[PDB]
């Protein structure tokens, strides 16, 4: 696919600094949906503000985890059938920690936002569309986690 090379190419720049870029993703995500903040409970504590999350080693570790799962999507983009079982469970894990499936659309918008801001001019409509199909496929995988 050429869809698959646009993903690879765009991913390369952000994948070099996953925490920086993942930090953009989650700052955006919290700006769009503040109610996600309380879902990250480390040490039984709740973050009061979005910026509290950025001081938390566990939250930042979660940013690294997120970027690794996305990087696995990019590597396996040509088929992606392959990650179906892993993603189904990851989806269930999130159902368990309290995430609504619908929240993953906001996640998608944050990812696209982060890519757009990092790529600027380079983020062509072909690229936006490729990433939307990829993520749409990804979230379909995950949605199995919700017993659906
Ligand atoms: C609505 C957005 C999200 C919320 C509220 C959320 C929250 C959480 C929480 C509370 C945990 C358990 C604590 C931890 O492991 O740090 C977790 C685990 C994890 N998350 Fe997320 N998460 C979100 C999105 C994502 C996304 C988009 C990805 C990847 C694309 C991801 C990847 C992971 C991974 C790999 C784990 C470890 C699960 C395990 O191995 O047990 N998360 N998430």
Swiss-Prot record:
Main location per the UniProt record: cytoplasm
Provenance organism: Mus musculus (Mouse)
Gene Ontology terms, MF aspect: GDP-dissociation inhibitor activity; heme binding; metal ion binding; nitrite reductase activity; oxygen binding; oxygen carrier activity
Family: Belongs to the globin family.
Post-translational modification: Phosphorylated during hypoxia by ERK1/ERK2. Phosphorylation regulates the heme pocket hexacoordination preventing the association of His-62 with the heme metal center. Thereby, promotes the access of dioxygen and nitrite to the heme and stimulates the nitrite reductase activity. Phosphorylation during hypoxia is stabilized by 14-3-3 proteins.
One GO BP: cellular response to hypoxia
Reaction catalysed by this enzyme: Fe(III)-heme b-[protein] + nitric oxide + H2O = Fe(II)-heme b-[protein] + nitrite + 2 H(+)
EC number assigned by the record: 1.7.-.-
UniProt domain Globin: residue ranges: 1-147
Enzyme type, top EC level: oxidoreductase
Assembly behavior: Monomer. Homodimer and homotetramer; disulfide-linked. Mainly monomeric but also detected as part of homodimers and homotetramers. Interacts with 14-3-3 proteins; regulates the phosphorylation of NGB. Could interact (ferrous form) with G-alpha(i) proteins (GTP-bound form).
Subcellular location as annotated: Cytoplasm, Cytosol; Mitochondrion matrix
CC per GO annotation: cytosol; mitochondrial matrix
Gene that specifies this protein: Ngb
Tissue: Predominantly expressed in brain.
CDD domains linked to this entry: Ngb
Name of the protein: Neuroglobin
Record keywords, A-Z: Cytoplasm, Disulfide bond, Heme, Iron, Metal-binding, Mitochondrion, Oxidoreductase, Phosphoprotein
Stimuli inducing this protein: Up-regulated upon oxygen-glucose deprivation.
Pfam families noted in UniProt: Globin
Binding site for heme b: 62, 94
Gene3D superfamilies, per database record: Globins (1.10.490.10)
Keyword Transport attached: no
Function: Monomeric globin with a bis-histidyl six-coordinate heme-iron atom through which it can bind dioxygen, carbon monoxide and nitric oxide. Could help transport oxygen and increase its availability to the metabolically active neuronal tissues, though its low quantity in tissues as well as its high affinity for dioxygen, which may limit its oxygen-releasing ability, argue against it. The ferrous/deoxygenated form exhibits a nitrite reductase activity and it could produce nitric oxide which in turn inhibits cellular respiration in response to hypoxia.
Consequence when changing residue 62 to L: Improved binding of dioxygen and carbon monoxide to the iron atom
